[PDB]
Amino acid sequence: MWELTILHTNDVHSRLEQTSEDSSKCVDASRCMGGVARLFTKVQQIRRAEPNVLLLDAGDQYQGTIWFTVYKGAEVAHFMNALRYDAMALGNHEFDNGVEGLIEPLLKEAKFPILSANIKAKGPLASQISGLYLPYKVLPVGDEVVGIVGYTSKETPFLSNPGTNLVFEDEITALQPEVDKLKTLNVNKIIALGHSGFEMDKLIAQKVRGVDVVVGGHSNTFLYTGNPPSKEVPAGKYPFIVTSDDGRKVPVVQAYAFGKYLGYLKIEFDERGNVISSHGNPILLDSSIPEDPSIKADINKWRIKLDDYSTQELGKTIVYLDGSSQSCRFRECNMGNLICDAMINNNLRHAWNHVSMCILNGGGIRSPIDERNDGTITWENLAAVLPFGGTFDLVQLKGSTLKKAFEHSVHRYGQSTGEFLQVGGIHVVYDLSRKPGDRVVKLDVLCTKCRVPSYDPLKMDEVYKVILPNFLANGGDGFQMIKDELLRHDSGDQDINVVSTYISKMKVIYPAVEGRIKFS
Amino acid sequence: MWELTILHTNDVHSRLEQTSEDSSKCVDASRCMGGVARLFTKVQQIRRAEPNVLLLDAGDQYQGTIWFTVYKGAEVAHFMNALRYDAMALGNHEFDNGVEGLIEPLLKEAKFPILSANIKAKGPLASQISGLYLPYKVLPVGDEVVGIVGYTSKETPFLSNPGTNLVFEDEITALQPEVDKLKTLNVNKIIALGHSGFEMDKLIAQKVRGVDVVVGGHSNTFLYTGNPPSKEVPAGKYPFIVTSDDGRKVPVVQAYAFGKYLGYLKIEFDERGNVISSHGNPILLDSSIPEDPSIKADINKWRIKLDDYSTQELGKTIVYLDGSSQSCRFRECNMGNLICDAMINNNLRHVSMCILNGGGIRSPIDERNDGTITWENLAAVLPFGGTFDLVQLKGSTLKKAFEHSVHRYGQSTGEFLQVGGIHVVYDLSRKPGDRVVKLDVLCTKCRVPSYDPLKMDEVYKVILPNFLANGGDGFQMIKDELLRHDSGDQDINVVSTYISKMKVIYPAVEGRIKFS
Ligand SMILES: O=P(O)(O)COC[C@H]1O[C@@H](n2ncc3c(NC4CCCC4)nc(Cl)nc32)[C@H](O)[C@@H]1O
Ligand SMILES: O=P(O)(O)COC[C@H]1O[C@@H](n2ncc3c(NC4CCCC4)nc(Cl)nc32)[C@H](O)[C@@H]1O
Ligand SMILES: [Ca+2]
Ligand SMILES: [Ca+2]
Ligand SMILES: [Zn+2]
Ligand SMILES: [Zn+2]
Ligand SMILES: [Zn+2]
Ligand SMILES: [Zn+2]
């Protein structure tokens, strides 16, 4: 028997400092969780106790808070080096600043292998990015060797900016030849570390022969064995066991998101590299684990530059602004209503030209905002909600295109995918019992060609003026029908600026869940 | 036979100048209607053509626009004298400024009889007011005499400020002895002119023996025979014929409101004062009738005082603010939503709920004037000078208030509620007191406000006008069952504050009120 402890993080999303338990800015420090200084403490405590330890990242360190807006990846390279990560798989967000935004801040500065077997570079980019990322890495672990094969979501070109000189091959197709190569190199212990979501992770475990453990991200999947330590409801047991097609039991792990937890799985391997047993659970990074003084002091040095921002309050909230994914990707969430009202207000202020409707991919809502901080909302709080630097664009759509967009919003409902829409000037009702593509049972919209605006059934053959983020207007999130069927598209103001000017105009905000979205 | 032409107006409500067709401020003068200068022109044309003419007012000349806010009734006395009205019945709004606000500006200055048979004065007020108003007046009309008996709503002490020295008797009870007295005085032709609403008007016609014609107001009832000239949908034929208990056919007339129409009914009487036939229709006072130059010039002299109010724009509206009664007393109206949002905003800057008697919404606001909203526009919407008060109520009291809101739905009564932070659904097929089928309210004891079914045993913080908080509009359950009542800011100031903060407004009818 040979034992390995896999320590793992995924979807940290610029949460370098300890956060509130919902991962919003830390205010009451005694109840704060996560951060890199606290993570360093737990890792050290496990490394001290266990002989064979790997610390892995399943991607999406990039994009999330003012840490990234300012350091653009340099903070990721620096503090992951400080923590001595053994390997990292590339996430879709690592491409948000293009290949140059990945190469210079992270690929050239990381002292640990960065992996992806399903990303192939072509032509001009190929010679530049040579060995800057790898398909796998064979890591010495004590008297053994462990192979770690990387993978990144197929939909990265539709979620990010990877550019035209990167070919995103199907995960399973690209993984099997890499795993088979490692077997010929007599690497009997194989970890698939990647960023495609829990459903693809279970598929890789099932189909890719020779993979022993799948470590994933992207779906922000919380898995737990027994009674959970916080507010996250588990999606299944930890580890999640997949019975593979070749007749093996393959554990699948994920550690939620935002560095709130440290994934922890102890594996017993046999002489031949097969998993005999696996047990563990994600470790809640709460107050009972102290922040490392050395890392903390270094975080405070790097914080001086973020503090240069105005601590000026854009306004106050008397209600909790629910910007969490388990709300905004599943049902009507008051943060979505606020952003849609900000969108409509911005466009109706300077204007046919009359815009009453708003759509907004819930997945584009990246953080909640707490109201107990005397209700204060600053640019830093807002930048965690809207970090992508997009614009709120004006589009002209047929009712049939909008009916299609709303069918797409729920086409794969239940997987925590980002396409679920938050709305303004629309009253939609879904019936999830119905087959995908026929789930919209009611779709009323606010009339424009009326002196008194009211909700009327959406007409297939009619034309509507919709305010939506540029991401959607450009057919992002699988909304092909918008880019292909739109009749007019006009660029709008910057997303964060639209919301901050609205908050400033309102002074005190109180958005509610009021029935814009219903389920029968 | 002897023919009489009854010309009549009711519920003019300070509409001294010509207005828009919805009775809001006149902007595009070429499409404007009503006003006293135009009314004077039609009256004059009828008077030259017909030998026997009476011009009557069925009350509610008072309260409505900045004309009243400034002139406090003096403008009513002056321009009704100019038009040479033959008689006027007292409306509930004639008491809005108390008895002193009725005595000095109007009663002492009117050159025509002011009537009410069901209002009895007691003690100190009695000796002051003697003969300033009368129960009836016998008017010479050619070689004949016509008796006009007046009446005022029983509900005046609960709608206005008449004071404690005025006893408002039931209309029918007070009318019959007065009509009977006139019969002994050999007055064979009797008109009941009053202000209690169409339903009481039909009742008076039916029960008060000897009344030949009922001229009314208060319900803003539009009656028409044939195809109507404007946007008002008739409530019945003109005149409305009631078969009285003594067997006779009694015509009932009303001329909508705001001086948009002039009521016009020709009556053929027999030598014994019995109506043989009656025919007519309200005359639309549109652009095809010129404003009288003399009255118009005099309106312009009286307008210099109002003009002193700075036309500073509080904000802009990109939508029509529907503040009409046929909307706000029947269903969810975007003006009600705006005022309720202004109410909630004022108090939240935790109170999530708002109720607002639709009858307290007195005018719409047009958006085609480049969207401009001034204090003058707002003063026509909120003319009563009330406050938006904080109240603490049990869910059962609120369920009662919502049952009262629709208890007599269909009569254009003011109690129908406009709401904020409430989602109500009614089923009018159901018996009164059991019409509320859904009542969800915005939670307070929650971090994220959502709509939850109203709990009978729970306590709620509601923002409502002082009028309602003090059990007005028949909302006895509020004054009697409330747990806490706190005075709020002045109604017009709350809304103007809000409009100024929002700059551009766009309220919508969004489903706060539904009908099953
Ligand atoms: O965040 P993970 O990859 O861990 C999982 O969630 C993914 C979801 O987030 C949403 N999303 N993704 C990217 C993206 C975006 N695009 C700019 C331009 C290129 C990158 C940023 N802008 C907006 Cl408005 N929302 C975005 C979207 O709803 C997606 O399904
Ligand atoms: O106007 P008319 O008499 O022709 C017919 O409509 C009557 C309706 O109007 C409403 N109403 N009446 C009076 C009144 C008010 N009271 C102040 C104190 C004393 C006078 C003004 N304040 C408010 Cl918020 N609304 C009021 C109420 O909804 C009533 O049913
Ligand atoms: Ca193996
Ligand atoms: Ca008679
Ligand atoms: Zn992520
Ligand atoms: Zn991702
Ligand atoms: Zn009236
Ligand atoms: Zn009245």
Curated annotation (Swiss-Prot), chain A:
Organism: Homo sapiens
Disease: Calcification of joints and arteries: A condition characterized by adult-onset calcification of the lower extremity arteries, including the iliac, femoral and tibial arteries, and hand and foot capsule joints. Age of onset has been reported as early as the second decade of life, usually involving intense joint pain or calcification in the hands.
EC supergroup of this enzyme: hydrolase
Cofactor: Zn(2+)
Positions marked as site (Transition state stabilizer): 93, 96
Function noted in UniProt: Catalyzes the hydrolysis of nucleotide monophosphates, releasing inorganic phosphate and the corresponding nucleoside, with AMP being the preferred substrate. Shows a preference for ribonucleotide monophosphates over their equivalent deoxyribose forms. Other substrates include IMP, UMP, GMP, CMP, dAMP, dCMP, dTMP, NAD and NMN.
GO MF, one example: zinc ion binding
Protein name in UniProt: 5'-nucleotidase
Subunit structure: Homodimer.
Disulphide bridges: 26-32, 328-333, 340-358, 447-450
PANTHER family found in the cross-reference section: 5'-NUCLEOTIDASE (PTHR11575:SF24), 5'-NUCLEOTIDASE-RELATED (PTHR11575)
Binding, Zn(2+) 2: 11, 60, 92, 195, 218
UniProt keyword Ubl conjugation, yes or no: no
Underlying gene: NT5E
Keyword DNA damage: no
Catalytic activity: a ribonucleoside 5'-phosphate + H2O = a ribonucleoside + phosphate; a 2'-deoxyribonucleoside 5'-phosphate + H2O = a 2'-deoxyribonucleoside + phosphate; dTMP + H2O = thymidine + phosphate; CMP + H2O = cytidine + phosphate
